[PDB]
Each structure stands twice: as structure tokens, then as C-alpha cells.
Amino acid sequence: HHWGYGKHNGPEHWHKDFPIAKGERQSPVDIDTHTAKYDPSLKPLSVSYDQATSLRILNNGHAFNVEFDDSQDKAVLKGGPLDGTYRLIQFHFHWGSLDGQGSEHTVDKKKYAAELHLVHWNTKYGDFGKAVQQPDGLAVLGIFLKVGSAKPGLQKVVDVLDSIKTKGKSADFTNFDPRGLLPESLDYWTYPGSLTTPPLLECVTWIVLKEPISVSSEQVLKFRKLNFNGEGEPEELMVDNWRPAQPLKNRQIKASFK
Numbered sequence: 001h002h003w004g005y006g007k008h009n010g011p012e013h014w015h016k017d018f019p020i021a022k023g024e025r026q027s028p029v030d031i032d033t034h035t036a037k038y039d040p041s042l043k044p045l046s047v048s049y050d051q052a053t054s055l056r057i058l059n060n061g062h063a064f065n066v067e068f069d070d071s072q073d074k075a076v077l078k079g080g081p082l083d084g085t086y087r088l089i090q091f092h093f094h095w096g097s098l099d100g101q102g103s104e105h106t107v108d109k110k111k112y113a114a115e116l117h118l119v120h121w122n123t124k125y126g127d128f129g130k131a132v133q134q135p136d137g138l139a140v141l142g143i144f145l146k147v148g149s150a151k152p153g154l155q156k157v158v159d160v161l162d163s164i165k166t167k168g169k170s171a172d173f174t175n176f177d178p179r180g181l182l183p184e185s186l187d188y189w190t191y192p193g194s195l196t197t198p199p200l201l202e203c204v205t206w207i208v209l210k211e212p213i214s215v216s217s218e219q220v221l222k223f224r225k226l227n228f229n230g231e232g233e234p235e236e237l238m239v240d241n242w243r244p245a246q247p248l249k250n251r252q253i254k255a256s257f258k
């Protein structure tokens, strides 16, 4: 498959190879704050990242992934809407060419400059490939980025991007603490959805944080210097690698906060 974000291979084309693109629980969605309902049954969200073990950062031609050792429970997400234990496997971002676009989820139709996805899988299914075949296989923690003050916890990521400029390049990325990417508040919205890239599988419990993090202009500018293309190929800047909001259909978005 040769999907991407251009006119000829972008989100409007994906359904031809991945018909679930037009399915009943696709992501992202617009979060209407005036219709999302507070759910008092939601348990506390538990982000347990103290023993996180990062390994590598990779430009995969769509975004860049920071990968983690998920062979044991070392960085997990629990609580909230979740039952059981979800292991952190990787995180990545989606971002824009302009500061007013880049996020996948929107809030009352507002776009943010970027969106962070921390991807976790349900350990009851044994490995990630099995988990993505289950309706409760994944939990993705989504965090909005707005342009303002620099995010110190993001700078080590920014610092290494020159070493993975093109598709297929990877670099060591051990001893990175993903706790430095979180906002102060863990207030969230949650709804059942999908992967936002092919194969678009409907296996995700989305947990989208209310509070955006701030990153600096220079930090997001360095995201935009990455390339979709491989080394030696014509340069295509890696920007606007986001899917737009999809129909909510038969779903309710719940809020953890009043």
C-alpha cells in the first residue's frame, strides 16, 4: 500500500484500500464540549511511566516514532475508561504547515498546531499485533500542542530530528522520559474510535487530554524540516500529516471533568 497525505494518496483515497475508513467508529472526531457529558463513573486515570524504557526514534515516512521496550510492564496506562493494563509501545506526532492546523482531533472545531499520540496496547492480548485486532486492544493518549513557551521535555526529541531527516532513518533514543511531554492536568475526554492512519482499525479507546501543552515556534519549525521522502529522493517536507475529523455516528464522548 502507498498511502500518504497528498492530493493523490491522502485521506480521501484511503477507503479504496481500507474500506473501514468509512466505518462506524472512525477517528479523529470533533469534540463538541457542549454535548460531551461528564461521566461520574470514570475511575481516576493512572499514567505510570517511571520505568519507561525508550529505545529508538524512526522516520517511517508518515511521522516519526519514538519506540519503547514493551516486553514487560514498564510504562503503562490504567484507570479512566480502561479495564486492565495497557503497555506503552510508542509515541508520535501529527502537525501542520501553519500554526492554526495540525491536530487530528478538534475541540469545538478548533485545530491545534499539532497532536501527540502515546500508543498503548492491552496486555491481555499478549502482543501488539493481536491487540490491534480487538475492539478494546489499544488506548491512545492524545495531547494537543499549541505554540507558546518551549516544552523542555520535548527538546531532546527536537535535538535528534536532524539525524532522522528522511524516510527509513533511525537513531538511538534511549533514556527518554515521556513524563516530560504531559500537561499539568489529566482531565480528559474519551470515546471509542480507530487508528487515524491505515489500516484504520477500530481498536482504540481514545483518551484526549483537555489541557494542551505549549511548544515553542522553533520546536515546531524543526518538525516541519523533516522529510516524507527517502534519502536521495526529491525533497517533500513532512507537514500536514493529519487526518481530518470523521463522522461521530453512533458514539458519545464522555468527559472526566465537570
Ligand SMILES: O=C(O)/C=C/c1ccc(Cl)cc1Cl
Pocket: 117, 119, 132, 140, 195, 196, 197, 198, 199
Ligand atoms: O496513531 C496513529 O496515528 C497511527 C497509529 C498506528 C498506525 C498503524 C498501525 Cl499498524 C498501528 C498504529 Cl498504533
Ligand code: NA
Pocket: 123, 124, 125, 126, 127
Ligand atoms: Na495474551
Ligand SMILES: [Zn+2]
Pocket: 092, 093, 094, 117, 196
Ligand atoms: Zn497518531
